Amino acid sequence: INIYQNPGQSLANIYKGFARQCNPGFVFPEAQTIEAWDIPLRLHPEFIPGGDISKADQQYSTLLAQEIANGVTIGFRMVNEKERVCNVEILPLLTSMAQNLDRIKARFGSGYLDRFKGSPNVYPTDVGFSTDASGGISQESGLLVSYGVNLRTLTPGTWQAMTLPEDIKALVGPGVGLRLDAPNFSDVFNTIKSGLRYTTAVTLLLAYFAAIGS
Amino acid sequence: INIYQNPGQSLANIYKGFARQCNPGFVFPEAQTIEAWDIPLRLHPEFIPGGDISKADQQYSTLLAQEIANGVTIGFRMVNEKERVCNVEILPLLTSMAQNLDRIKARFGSGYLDRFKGSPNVYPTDVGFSTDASGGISQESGLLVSYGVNLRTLTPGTWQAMTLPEDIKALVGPGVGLRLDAPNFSDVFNTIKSGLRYTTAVTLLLAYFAAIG
Amino acid sequence: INIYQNPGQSLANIYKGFARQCNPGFVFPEAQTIEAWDIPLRLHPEFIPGGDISKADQQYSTLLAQEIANGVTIGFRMVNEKERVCNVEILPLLTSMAQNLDRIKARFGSGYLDRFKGSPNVYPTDVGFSTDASGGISQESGLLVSYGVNLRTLTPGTWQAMTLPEDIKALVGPGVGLRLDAPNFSDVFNTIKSGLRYTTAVTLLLAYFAAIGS
Amino acid sequence: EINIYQNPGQSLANIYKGFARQCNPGFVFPEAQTIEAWDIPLRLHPEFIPGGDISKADQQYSTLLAQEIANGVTIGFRMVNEKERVCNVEILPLLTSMAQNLDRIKARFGSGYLDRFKGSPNVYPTDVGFSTDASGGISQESGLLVSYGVNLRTLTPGTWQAMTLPEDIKALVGPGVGLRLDAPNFSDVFNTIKSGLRYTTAVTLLLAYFAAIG
Amino acid sequence: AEINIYQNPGQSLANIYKGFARQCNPGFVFPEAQTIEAWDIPLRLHPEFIPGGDISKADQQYSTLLAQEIANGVTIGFRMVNEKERVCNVEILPLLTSMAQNLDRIKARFGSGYLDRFKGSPNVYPTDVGFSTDASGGISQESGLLVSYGVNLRTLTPGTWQAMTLPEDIKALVGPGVGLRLDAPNFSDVFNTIKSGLRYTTAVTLLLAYFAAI
Amino acid sequence: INIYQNPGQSLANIYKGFARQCNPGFVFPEAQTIEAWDIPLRLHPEFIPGGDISKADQQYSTLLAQEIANGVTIGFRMVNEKERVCNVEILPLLTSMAQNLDRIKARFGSGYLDRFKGSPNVYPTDVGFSTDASGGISQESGLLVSYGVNLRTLTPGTWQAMTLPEDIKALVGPGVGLRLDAPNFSDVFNTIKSGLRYTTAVTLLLAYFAAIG
Amino acid sequence: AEINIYQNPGQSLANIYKGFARQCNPGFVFPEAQTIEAWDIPLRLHPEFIPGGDISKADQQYSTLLAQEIANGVTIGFRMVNEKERVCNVEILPLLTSMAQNLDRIKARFGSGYLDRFKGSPNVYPTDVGFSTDASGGISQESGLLVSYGVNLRTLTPGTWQAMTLPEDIKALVGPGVGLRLDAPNFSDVFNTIKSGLRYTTAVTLLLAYFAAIG
Amino acid sequence: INIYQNPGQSLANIYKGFARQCNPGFVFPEAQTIEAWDIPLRLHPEFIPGGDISKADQQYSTLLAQEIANGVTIGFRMVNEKERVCNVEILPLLTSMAQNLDRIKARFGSGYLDRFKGSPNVYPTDVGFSTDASGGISQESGLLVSYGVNLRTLTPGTWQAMTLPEDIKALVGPGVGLRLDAPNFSDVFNTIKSGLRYTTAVTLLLAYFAAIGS
């Protein structure tokens, strides 16, 4: 295996290593973690055209190189930030996603990827504009993140049924209900665009679609 | 004086040192530099409310600290990157601003600060959205940078009439003519927003209003 | 349609009648007239909060009512004063505004409304004070009328380049170049403030911006 | 392909389509109407080019063409200092207004419209002569007859006001409207229009008049 | 009585402008002594222009400037009919007024020997357009425009430019070159626009405004 | 096709018409004419932003309009001035350019366009100031026209090798070797600037680079 | 050998200075290439000093400069006997060293066409002393000293002056003019000290020091 | 200096010696000789890695040793072959290179070294295969020697314009226009490759680029 063609499995492997550092007694949700981090590739198999990795989509590769770079940062931080890395960042993310994946499959069945397709966002980390009825953009628009995470339109019912690790919740919270003409919109847009990673954008996607319509 | 009630003078002094280090012969345009870097505070006296700096606008103060820190980085880079710091970065910026400020004062007159009013942007580094023909924001809108810099409507002619340092042009050029609904819009928005500093946003502001267009 | 949400189309409809009563051959400049008299609502969409005409801005509504009432006086005056009403007041207005709008659109492009922003004036009949170099108001300031008509700095060359109906030129000329501390300033300010209407303020706005500057 | 002698409309339309694009590339150029209008004189008078031999071209016709070329050279120089005035008072209003006038003529007379211009004593579009009584005689009641039937003597204040013309042209011709040949200034007016008109602008005046009359 | 434009240029042109000033406003007080004195300045600086008092040996370039000026008086004559208000109140009376006030400031500051102020540029003719100098007599990339007898546009501050008393038409022509370096994108256009736009009389107007104000 | 997106083809068509009028046996060098007159657009694709001619560069558009107006004049003048128009103005131009272009392609190869890059002139008709031997602009400088034609340094040997139509030769001749500080500089600068056209500037450019050395 | 001082002033004077330097320290590496090139500068700027390659028509002022240079070499020969320490370590070797370094700086900065930097002052001779200019080509009371081929003392900064590599005696001669305005009470004295003190050879030393430092 | 870091100066010094023996009055083109023989080093600074000549590129070092060994031979041959050595081999080589380098400087400008970049050949003595008109190597290709000397496309005009010493002309002549599939290709290729040396490959490179185009 390799990270371009097996992103879930590759990253799962690294995160299984982290989860063991944290607690060898923690049951790593491996099935769900591979499935979740494979979602962007499922939706976009052209990321690896005709199966040759030599022609891999540049933006997709950059995202994976970002995850590699983040995994390096975690190894260094495990040393003197073990109790945050483990109990705020990594284990909550893994538990969260697995539960959220499981509820998506339960609510939407085996065709659940259909909920994610048809968005104008190609990459799981994209931040763009929500659209009006006709598909236009207006000043009533807000943030559309990942594969259909509409923060502008995000209801209180949806928000309160959402299970997100603290760090992702804190990133994305300020964007909920926010109009593009709001004084902090540029800042919040910029902050969410810069703060997302491949893995954490999936984590957000799963939380949203698990809870949507609550 | 201090950097908060006198940003133009304070920054001008730092940059005078950079210029003397680069080129002692180079005549430093002190009056223009001071007046240019005073523009956001003249536009926004609320930044220092009742004249007490301990209550100064936080975003404004942070903008100015970034300039102090960048100044320290510039002086560090003078050893191994003198060619680029001097002849690509600092001297072109100083000349550009003096020429564009004077041009602005010649073409619009002494009341030139009015041309900087009406924008959705409070801070000189702000990056927002231009309004379309209806007066709203739409997919046809684009980047509204600083105090009136409309990258969306920025013309071919205007682009090539603009006197502007290489790095600012490199930063901002991908945003020229760019619509909200462009696939790369988010990226280009992000880059420009992250790339601007107080001094360079004013440099861009002046180049645009001197060239339009 | 109604005069609150559709001021340009409602005022155009009235003026189209007056122009027929004046000269049936006169080609009414409908598109420009509607676009010109909508400008104030275009600049301030909050005048009608959330599409609700009962919550319409009272000062905005009152300016429109005065145009309706003026319309009634115009129809009265057609009998004994047709020659002045038609040839001095109405037809030159309609023609000048259409020409000036078109010129403005040609000089400043589709985003021409921007040239109207940043003034201290909210209403098109507003009369406030010119700025000096400092950013402030002083004795060497003068009249700033409507959305950016700086009478203080308006030059002799610009005055005679402007296409403005007689009745508005005679109203506004006295304030050209006039300082706050001028002995006749208060009387001139009084005369301009009292004689301006919603439609004739827009007429002046377009004449000025067609003829400056840059 | 074409030349100004055999193809005056296309040749002149091409030059003005040039001036219009440097002025404003957003400007929707009315190519069809401009070719047609500036062809009028040659359609009424094909003997200007006897049997398609441009070396036997009519003297007064060739001179009118050289004048237009010379005027185009003047315009090119004026575009350096006075670009705004030339574009937006001169060239663009002439084009839009002349197209509108031709369109109106065609909607109210069909393809048969050239018949309006027929059987004038004026051979050339720039000709300025005398209006005539019922029986075809000149009297002290005569005034100006310009181009292919533009009777200024007989032209009402009303019809004049109904005419859609650029400023340049209303200013030149207005003083002749209603003017008797025994008027103290008639000879000044005659002298000004004769020297002021050109092939191009005489057609502009023709189309404005026939679009308005009756 | 026996004056000519070669030997008596100020008096010759004064006679013509006094006739314009009367066409304009018989109540305008013509500043005759100042106008004669100002327009003689180029000849007083360069007696050479007429070697030994022999006008048949007159300097070609000087003679060409005087012919330019005659040709311009002919066009003003023509423009008096259709553009009298612009001609009189923007172009002519302000020129005469400002020139007289500025010449008087200069005399009050320097006395009868004021002509020495105008010496020392490389420019032989009042309409000359050349380059600003460094401190070493050379031309560098920091040079800009140096026009007429020492009007250094490159080093003129916008403060003193705006303090200068000058006809609008002259401000608009010359303003673009204030502070402008020779490598600016528009320098070549500006250099050449001022070069083609200046005339014997308006260059002297500019010269006196500049020397009064600096 | 149109003149904006297809200047070489639109212009070559018109001149092919003139040349057939001049001599139907004259072999019109069509590939070379089109190639030469597309040069400016190939150096500057931004002249037509994103392929949209409603957004065309205004200065570019103006040069092209001038060439169309000139074509109308050529058509008028063909009646009584056919000998000059053909044997002085048009045929030698087309002949000279095709030969110079072929030589330039042989000498600098397929990437020849890079020889026209990095001048301070954006438009083919631009007239600016050369850089001196030490790399600055000074009184030792002269005229820099189009995409690198240095009239100041133009040697006697280059001049006599140049194959140039006589109207272009008469225009540009006075600028050869002319210093910024010369008494008649400003006069010649003005004359050359006003007298150049899009097609004639391109003709000069190829004559120069075909003859240097 | 088959050279002469009018056509080969650099090589000629270099030949004499190679001799002084060997007197000073046989172990001193004489910068011959830079020395010939530096002292050819005035002739390379004004080839009309020898019109048509004909020394019989040599410019009188040029020749006078060369005569003065010969006379100065004679006096150094005499002072070598009793003032060897100063002649060697204050006057000559520092001059030779400094010109070499300054010239290589100038050539690295501007390339082979460096000579263009030295043009366009109104000074024809390397020892000329004249007036700096305002921005309009004139002289005003803000003007000061303009020396040699563009050494603008009026405009020269006390800092960039300190940064110039220059032998003591030239530094002492020219320092008083730095920034000096023409209405200063010592201007006439300083103007004329510098004028009288300069030689072809030491004017070129000053020229290269300035143009190496000035940017 | 040494031959590794300073190949131009070292070799010019040897050749200055030979020229001196040939004819003392022959002006040695010293600047051009040093510059030309530095070309291969300028293009490949990496030949001396981090300024350490003990790690100098072996092929490049061998090239220069060959030139030292050839110098010794020339010295030996000076006795019984001075005429040929001087008038055929040495004097024409130095004069040709100097003229050619000067022509290349005028033709291509100060960045002329850019003409020598992008070839497949690293060493000046390399012989490879040229690119055909469609951009590939094929049987239509031929000999590409040194930094861009394309013998395959080398025209009759370029051949006659080329200023080249007799021995190089005879070495290289049979390769001109020669195709890869020619029966004598192998022989000529082998001959050119074995017969070239550092100095002479540079002499050829310069002959060609100074003559291309004719």
PDB file of N, CA and C in Angstrom, chain B residues 96-118:
ATOM      1  N   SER B  96       8.030  54.015  -5.407  1.00  0.00           N
ATOM      2  CA  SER B  96       6.650  53.718  -5.775  1.00  0.00           C
ATOM      3  C   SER B  96       5.651  54.560  -4.967  1.00  0.00           C
ATOM      4  N   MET B  97       5.757  54.500  -3.645  1.00  0.00           N
ATOM      5  CA  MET B  97       4.869  55.258  -2.789  1.00  0.00           C
ATOM      6  C   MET B  97       5.012  56.770  -2.929  1.00  0.00           C
ATOM      7  N   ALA B  98       6.244  57.282  -2.988  1.00  0.00           N
ATOM      8  CA  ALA B  98       6.431  58.728  -3.144  1.00  0.00           C
ATOM      9  C   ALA B  98       5.851  59.184  -4.476  1.00  0.00           C
ATOM     10  N   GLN B  99       6.104  58.421  -5.533  1.00  0.00           N
ATOM     11  CA  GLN B  99       5.594  58.805  -6.834  1.00  0.00           C
ATOM     12  C   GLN B  99       4.071  58.724  -6.967  1.00  0.00           C
ATOM     13  N   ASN B 100       3.499  57.689  -6.372  1.00  0.00           N
ATOM     14  CA  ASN B 100       2.068  57.447  -6.448  1.00  0.00           C
ATOM     15  C   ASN B 100       1.289  58.406  -5.558  1.00  0.00           C
ATOM     16  N   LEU B 101       1.818  58.742  -4.384  1.00  0.00           N
ATOM     17  CA  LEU B 101       1.174  59.729  -3.507  1.00  0.00           C
ATOM     18  C   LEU B 101       1.128  61.109  -4.164  1.00  0.00           C
ATOM     19  N   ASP B 102       2.231  61.505  -4.782  1.00  0.00           N
ATOM     20  CA  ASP B 102       2.284  62.829  -5.400  1.00  0.00           C
ATOM     21  C   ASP B 102       1.376  62.897  -6.633  1.00  0.00           C
ATOM     22  N   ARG B 103       1.400  61.838  -7.438  1.00  0.00           N
ATOM     23  CA  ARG B 103       0.496  61.684  -8.551  1.00  0.00           C
ATOM     24  C   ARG B 103      -0.978  61.819  -8.112  1.00  0.00           C
ATOM     25  N   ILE B 104      -1.343  61.107  -7.049  1.00  0.00           N
ATOM     26  CA  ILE B 104      -2.682  61.165  -6.464  1.00  0.00           C
ATOM     27  C   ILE B 104      -3.038  62.599  -6.057  1.00  0.00           C
ATOM     28  N   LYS B 105      -2.133  63.269  -5.354  1.00  0.00           N
ATOM     29  CA  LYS B 105      -2.358  64.665  -4.978  1.00  0.00           C
ATOM     30  C   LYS B 105      -2.454  65.601  -6.182  1.00  0.00           C
ATOM     31  N   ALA B 106      -1.770  65.271  -7.280  1.00  0.00           N
ATOM     32  CA  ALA B 106      -1.913  66.069  -8.512  1.00  0.00           C
ATOM     33  C   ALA B 106      -3.209  65.826  -9.265  1.00  0.00           C
ATOM     34  N   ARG B 107      -3.658  64.566  -9.360  1.00  0.00           N
ATOM     35  CA  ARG B 107      -4.848  64.233 -10.185  1.00  0.00           C
ATOM     36  C   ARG B 107      -6.189  64.384  -9.485  1.00  0.00           C
ATOM     37  N   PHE B 108      -6.189  64.257  -8.159  1.00  0.00           N
ATOM     38  CA  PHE B 108      -7.422  64.367  -7.388  1.00  0.00           C
ATOM     39  C   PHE B 108      -7.443  65.594  -6.497  1.00  0.00           C
ATOM     40  N   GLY B 109      -6.273  66.165  -6.250  1.00  0.00           N
ATOM     41  CA  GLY B 109      -6.190  67.361  -5.445  1.00  0.00           C
ATOM     42  C   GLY B 109      -5.955  67.082  -3.977  1.00  0.00           C
ATOM     43  N   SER B 110      -5.959  68.160  -3.190  1.00  0.00           N
ATOM     44  CA  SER B 110      -5.750  68.105  -1.743  1.00  0.00           C
ATOM     45  C   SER B 110      -6.800  67.296  -0.977  1.00  0.00           C
ATOM     46  N   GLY B 111      -8.024  67.209  -1.493  1.00  0.00           N
ATOM     47  CA  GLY B 111      -9.060  66.390  -0.846  1.00  0.00           C
ATOM     48  C   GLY B 111      -9.022  64.900  -1.168  1.00  0.00           C
ATOM     49  N   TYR B 112      -7.862  64.410  -1.611  1.00  0.00           N
ATOM     50  CA  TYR B 112      -7.700  63.046  -2.150  1.00  0.00           C
ATOM     51  C   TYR B 112      -8.157  61.906  -1.226  1.00  0.00           C
ATOM     52  N   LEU B 113      -8.163  62.138   0.084  1.00  0.00           N
ATOM     53  CA  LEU B 113      -8.610  61.125   1.060  1.00  0.00           C
ATOM     54  C   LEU B 113     -10.036  60.636   0.858  1.00  0.00           C
ATOM     55  N   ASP B 114     -10.866  61.438   0.179  1.00  0.00           N
ATOM     56  CA  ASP B 114     -12.248  61.057  -0.148  1.00  0.00           C
ATOM     57  C   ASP B 114     -12.324  59.821  -1.011  1.00  0.00           C
ATOM     58  N   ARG B 115     -11.366  59.661  -1.918  1.00  0.00           N
ATOM     59  CA  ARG B 115     -11.343  58.505  -2.820  1.00  0.00           C
ATOM     60  C   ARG B 115     -11.187  57.200  -2.048  1.00  0.00           C
ATOM     61  N   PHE B 116     -10.757  57.306  -0.792  1.00  0.00           N
ATOM     62  CA  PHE B 116     -10.529  56.123   0.057  1.00  0.00           C
ATOM     63  C   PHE B 116     -11.717  55.814   0.951  1.00  0.00           C
ATOM     64  N   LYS B 117     -12.764  56.624   0.852  1.00  0.00           N
ATOM     65  CA  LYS B 117     -13.953  56.448   1.676  1.00  0.00           C
ATOM     66  C   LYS B 117     -14.991  55.648   0.899  1.00  0.00           C
ATOM     67  N   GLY B 118     -15.935  55.037   1.609  1.00  0.00           N
ATOM     68  CA  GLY B 118     -17.064  54.339   0.978  1.00  0.00           C
ATOM     69  C   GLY B 118     -16.903  52.829   0.885  1.00  0.00           C
TER      70      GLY B 118
END
